[model samples]
Target: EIKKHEEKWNKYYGVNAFNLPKELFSKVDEKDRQKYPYNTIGNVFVKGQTSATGVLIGKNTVLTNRHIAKFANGDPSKVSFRPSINTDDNGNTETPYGEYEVKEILQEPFGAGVDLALIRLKPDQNGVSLGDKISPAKIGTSNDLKDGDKLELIGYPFEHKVNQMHRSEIELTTLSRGLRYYGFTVPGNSGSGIFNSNGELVGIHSSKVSHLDREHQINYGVGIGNYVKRIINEKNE
Candidate 1:
């Protein structure tokens, strides 16, 4: 059993709410620059706006938050995915693993409540697979999560040059579902992959603790439970 956490004003959002904020101080944020070796996670950029992040689950399937679908003009076809987004690519000519079009929105428009989605990517004429290009992250579960696990959140956060990946020593609270991680984040990090020290997937970063006060809040993520597994298993088939 996990140890109990010291109680506070953030009573789950009912005794059970899931979601919050993503802010990183300048120098602290700089530490995570390009340090991530795994290439499966990359930028999900929409037209005329900033980008959120997503991970390659299968050869043609990208896992991300349902709300991120909106960035694609509420239609999957409106999106473009380029894996391994080197921050130096402000030059507009250097996407390392090539780009693909989103062919379908695998998730229903369930919006905020369900908060998860996948995009079927278009393949090349020769039937080249994304998994062949950029190695996908190994998907696992948060079931192994301990009381004091230091979960690392990897993503392209707001206004950052390189990807901002940070580790937070988490305090496991009510592990039945959502994660209350005290990590560094910002708005664009909404769809980040929550990983363990060994670089395996544990959860999908979704929302942040919202309140009138600034420093007293936290971030929320969805555990890598069976639901995540179901989506991936079906897609690979």
Candidate 2:
């Protein structure tokens, strides 16, 4: 499991890790950095704009929320991607100019309910490689996760003070599917990637809704298994 995480983290963060706010940086320890290596992450840049918690799925493909790509309105020719962002040593901020364009956008069939989108780039831009196999996560047979089953949320939150190009990971206690402890997601992170313990693609960070009296609320991700299976079946046909 750790090996898988090591590979995944390196690919994700190694290419896109950047500095965070001083307060947040102070909280991170060497152990935390090692546990969450910097390579398994990347930034989702659209026409020079970037958001948090996005991941590279293939050499030319990115997995994010539909809303993130909505800014492009189904146009891949208008988006771009960047890998391995650099930051200052203090870990409080990031450098600018890390941007890319959108080549294409692919969303799920059921509209925003799934809230997933795949952004493809042109051949020139170097994107991450999606491995030949998809890692299967332990979602449990019933799709019911316990209150404290340990959920890992990855995204580019707004408060971190990074240059909008960095990606961050946080561990949160599970709140019910539609209730509390959902996960920490922010504006720029709308299209971030969500994964399970096994380093498998589980969901795409869709959006945060206003429930109760909360301001920046819980996160929602679109599951990838069903859609991926359908794509595979279609390809085989």
Candidate 3:
């Protein structure tokens, strides 16, 4: 009985409760993921399993949370990326763009305890790479955003057993160490990219603060601006 009620609640609240102008927590099918913006996002796998979501920020760089990076225990080879991965109706996994292993893990240098990391992917067979197939998401400045601005998040939620992408629209509540937002997300969403309406990356999704009511639950993320200095410095080198 409890399982039935939970399922019904998930369906209604997951789709209809959020009255955003755009679609809320909607699924992105395999074909749709192969398109721009979405193609740049992929799963961060550690030790052969999905750990979190990550976004391509450069030709071979993927941005995700430091916690997710720690899962590999400083072993780059233990991490991999599969752009626009999907599970078909027949329950089969598909990697439309193939997979790339991690070459290195770049964490914040200032020791500010920032929960962000950049994964450098090694080239695949034939000397090709992830960026060779998909363009990275345009990086944006979170410092310019005002309160109440609408943002978007796309990732693989654990609730979706077959590994599909779901996009959620959220509102910026405030800014501090990272980013505080008002939206819906689950455990698997950590490391997902938070994007502006223009499809520019503004933050990295982290986690949420618990609250008694769903209306008051607050989501959290690491502002991409926090690493702008490092990103620029690395890009030049």
Candidate 4:
């Protein structure tokens, strides 16, 4: 049975309740940022301010946390997305796939437990979609995942240079409707894409789980495959 796993959980009863610090992230090589999934991952800016991470899931759509997709001032026009950002030693920045304005934000009704959200971008002046430039990550199921399965986390964390991508290979600590992962993260890591071994999109990092006494924390993610499947189809239909 899974009893042994429970015992493993019991072993770490009293620890400091804090999210993983920022330095644990490794910068993605400049060349690697041009690759498929990494190229699809980008920075989510709220009202012209650097906020969180987001990934392209469709021709004009990006998947991120609902909180990240929505601005406190309720203006969707203020949000923007820039894909595959790279910076040089001279401090010049580049966006290989260019920037797009957020046209809309759609969120799940299931509350924070399913913090997934979709941001649809307006087509560029030349009528080119982000998906037309770079391929989107394929959506995959998370139900088949179990304890200790390896997953990859990639995103733009604040600890790194502005809008540059960082990555960390993490494992599933456990699952309870949402994913509990053992990984390194900080504020800017929220809404980062969680990809499976097959490089399929399985979930999106949301928050961290903490003990009642404020002593013990683990990363939490929303299992978006199931919800995204329905949401995408319903919206398209």
Models, CA RMSD each: 7.1, 10.0, 5.6, 4.9
- Cα-based TM-score, every candidate: 0.73, 0.59, 0.82, 0.83
TM-score of 2: 0.59
- Root-mean-square deviation of Cα positions for candidate 2 versus the true structure, in angstroms: 10.0
Index of the highest-TM-score prediction? 4
Per-residue alpha-carbon lDDT of candidate 4 for residues 1-237, written as tens digits (9 for 90 to 100): 245534444333223312223333468888889886788798888855547888898989888887776562446677888887766547888887777987776755445557777788888889899898888888887878898888889997765456768886667865754688767666678888888767888888887777223555678888765666777656531
Over the full model, what C-alpha lDDT does candidate 2 score relative to the true structure?
0.46
Clash count list over all predictions: 8, 32, 0, 1
lDDT of each: 0.63, 0.46, 0.73, 0.74
Model 4 — which ten-residue stretch has the worst lDDT?
Answer: 12-21
lDDT of 4 at 233: 53
After superposition, candidate 1 runs with Cα above 4 Å error: 1-37, 89-93, 109-112, 162-177, 210-216
Can you list the residue pairs that collide in candidate 1? 20-207, 20-208, 20-209, 21-208, 21-209, 22-185, 22-186, 23-185
- Cα lDDT of model 3 by residue, 173-216, tens digit: 64643577666677778888888878888888888764335543
- 94-130, model 1: which lDDT tens digit per residue? 5666788777876543335766778778886577877
RMSD of 1: 7.1
* TM value for model 1: 0.73
- Residue 216, model 3, lDDT: 38
Clashing residue pairs in candidate 4 (N, C-alpha, C atoms within 3 angstroms)? 17-216
User: Can you tell me which runs of candidate 2 are displaced by over 4 Å?
Assistant: 1-38, 48-50, 89-101, 108-110, 125-144, 164-180, 212-217, 225-237
Task: Please list the residue runs of candidate 3 whose C-alpha ends up more than 4 Å from where it truly belongs after superposition.
Answer: 1-22, 48-50, 108-112, 210-217, 226-229, 232-237
